[PDB]
Ligand binder design. Sequence first.
Ligand SMILES: CCCCCCCC(=O)SCCNC(=O)CCNC(=O)[C@H](O)C(C)(C)COP(=O)(O)OP(=O)(O)OC[C@H]1O[C@@H](n2cnc3c(N)ncnc32)[C@H](O)[C@@H]1OP(=O)(O)O
Ligand SMILES: N[C@@H]1[C@@H](O)[C@H](O)[C@@H](CO)O[C@H]1O
Length: 323
Amino acid sequence: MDPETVRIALGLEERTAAWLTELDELGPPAEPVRLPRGEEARDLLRRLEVPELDAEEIVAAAPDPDRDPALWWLLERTHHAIVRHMGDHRAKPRGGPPLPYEGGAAARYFHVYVFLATVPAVRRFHAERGIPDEVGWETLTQLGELVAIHRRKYGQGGMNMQWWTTYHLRGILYRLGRLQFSLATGKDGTPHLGLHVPEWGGPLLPKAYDESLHRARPFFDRHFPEHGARVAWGSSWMLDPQLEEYLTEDSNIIQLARFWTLTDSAPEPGNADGDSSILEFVFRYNGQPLDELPQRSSLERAVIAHLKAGRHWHMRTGFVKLP
Ligand SMILES: CCCCCCCC(=O)SCCNC(=O)CCNC(=O)[C@H](O)C(C)(C)COP(=O)(O)OP(=O)(O)OC[C@H]1O[C@@H](n2cnc3c(N)ncnc32)[C@H](O)[C@@H]1OP(=O)(O)O
Ligand SMILES: N[C@@H]1[C@@H](O)[C@H](O)[C@@H](CO)O[C@H]1O
């Protein structure tokens, strides 16, 4: 098989040829790709908290080297492209393009198969770094969340956040209770930890937040002592001071943001970039006209109002010192 044949077979944009050539050069992994099957696949998916509806469909559609040779060629090389960067937070998060849905369920669940095929590799890395099993597993369960999110957002099974799953799969991101932390470095190479909030796990309670923060240094200093971060950095819609206009005092976002020191400049009022991000995280926004979107929470009402009024939301960046 060749990258042009693969590209055309799967119906990928000409845009992706460079990626495909790169993968082509890279070749198959030393350890040949293996997909768990049947009840082994069910157990793994269940452990990764993939909802049952999706897990059944994932197993049923599992591709095959002989019947799906283009898709299988990509599966091995995409797996290879991730594992070669195991432990390496300096490499860009390149998970590969999404596959056109005309390839059916195997195409839609492509990056789930990448994730399943890569679990053994990253779990070995976890073991080597002395990471507790429950931490490793808890970290990998975001696969379920992102699978469920695809369904809510689009109407059928899939997982199109493969750029993000490169972090879990390279063992450079760990969920430590309510928050996640990623190995990171600034433009000047100073190590920090990136701080992230997964959807699942309920509201962002001060006490859960605070516990996660207490876990970060001891965890990273024990298992990645070479890193030495003192500070956590976040970029998020939820760091927009403009939220103070709409959210009240019981809002966990309003209380927690107060600890943060913002480091980017106040954005231009007319800049529109942070719009799609807040829309994504609040509504899983999929192009629909704003009046259809639910209005059941103060935040839901807030983000519409603000946009209706011809105003814009921005992503802000800030830091907190790790306790
Ligand atoms: C504060 C630290 C900043 C650190 C930077 C983090 C960097 C990133 O990870 S960027 C991505 C962030 N992740 C997400 O957005 C995940 C999806 N979002 C969520 O699950 C939630 O927003 C979550 C859990 C994080 C916060 O929820 P919660 O603790 O309820 O927020 P809170 O400020 O207390 O809520 C205020 C109101 O808005 C509602 N609300 C909050 N978030 C959402 C949401 N995503 N969708 C709908 N309604 C929401 C609440 O239900 C509450 O409603 P009401 O006043 O009507 O009772
Ligand atoms: N889509 C990702 C989220 O899944 C993640 O929680 C956040 C962390 O800042 O980064 C966003 O771009």
